[PDB]
Amino acid sequence: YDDINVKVDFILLEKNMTINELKMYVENELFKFPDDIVKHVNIKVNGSLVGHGELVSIEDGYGIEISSWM
Amino acid sequence: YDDINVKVDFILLEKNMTINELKMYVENELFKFPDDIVKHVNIKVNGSLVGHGELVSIEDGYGIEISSWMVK
């Protein structure tokens, strides 16, 4: 079983919004969100939520720090 | 039929790995994305790839500028 493969998703943000709302964002070429989402990244394995995450600035690039795990 | 509600995901990375490999992930660990990680966010609606965006800092907030959108 630990021989098989799964997909690990580092999800910056999930947000619910109408097809209408979504479409406004596509018109404005920008989704606009009030801060924070860099601190609260979620790490799901095909729906099952494993841990939390934080996007950090390191080595002249980016990385993730595992704030929570399960 | 546009006032219907849907689930949009802003996805930084999908890593395929064994549950064995997945064991090699621990708490307070630190991983290293590539440098194209903020410039290649995948935008998903109900699990469907509808485009790609770039994460930017803005005033008091963060936003995802859209670089490609794959549906109309």
Residue numbers in the entry:
A (entry chain A): 221 to 290
B (entry chain B): 221 to 292
Q: What do the study's own words say?
A:
In particular, the protein Spa33 (SctQ), which is essential for secretion and localises to the base of the S. flexneri NF‐T3SS in situ via association with the basal body (Morita‐Ishihara et al., 2006; Barison et al., 2012), has been proposed to form a substructure termed the cytoplasmic‐ring (C‐ring) (Morita‐Ishihara et al., 2006). In this study, we show that alternative translation occurs to generate full‐length Spa33 (Spa33‐FL) and a shorter C‐terminal fragment (Spa33‐C) within S. flexneri, with the production of both being required for assembly and function of the NF‐T3SS. High resolution biophysical studies demonstrate that Spa33‐FL and Spa33‐C associate to form a minimal 1:2 complex that then undergoes further oligomerisation to produce elongated arrays.
The 2.3 Å resolution crystal structure of Spa33208‐293 was subsequently determined by molecular replacement. The structure shows a SpoA domain that forms the expected saddle‐shaped homodimer with an approximate twofold rotational symmetry axis. Regions of notable asymmetry have high B‐factors, suggesting conformational flexibility accounts for major differences between the dimer halves. Indeed superimposition of Spa33208‐293 with T. maritima FliN (Brown et al., 2005) (2.18 Å RMSD, 126 Cα atoms), Yersinia pseudotuberculosis YscQ‐C (Bzymek et al., 2012) (2.09 Å RMSD, 135 Cα atoms) and Pseudomonas syringae HrcQB‐C (Fadouloglou et al., 2004) (2.40 Å RMSD, 133 Cα atoms) shows a remarkably similar arrangement of secondary structure elements. In order to gain insights into the interaction of Spa33‐FL with Spa33‐C2, the intermolecular contacts of the Spa33208‐293 crystal were investigated and revealed a dimer–dimer interface formed by an equivalent surface of each homodimer, comprising regions proximal to the N‐terminus, C‐terminus and β3‐β4 turn from one chain and α1 from the other. This interaction buries a surface area of 508 Å2 and is stabilised by three hydrogen bonds and hydrophobic interactions between apolar residues that are conserved with SpoA1 of Spa33‐FL and orthologous domains. Indeed, a continuous spiral of Spa33208‐293 dimers is observed in the crystal lattice, providing a molecular model for formation of higher molecular weight oligomers by the analogous dimers of Spa33‐FL/C2.
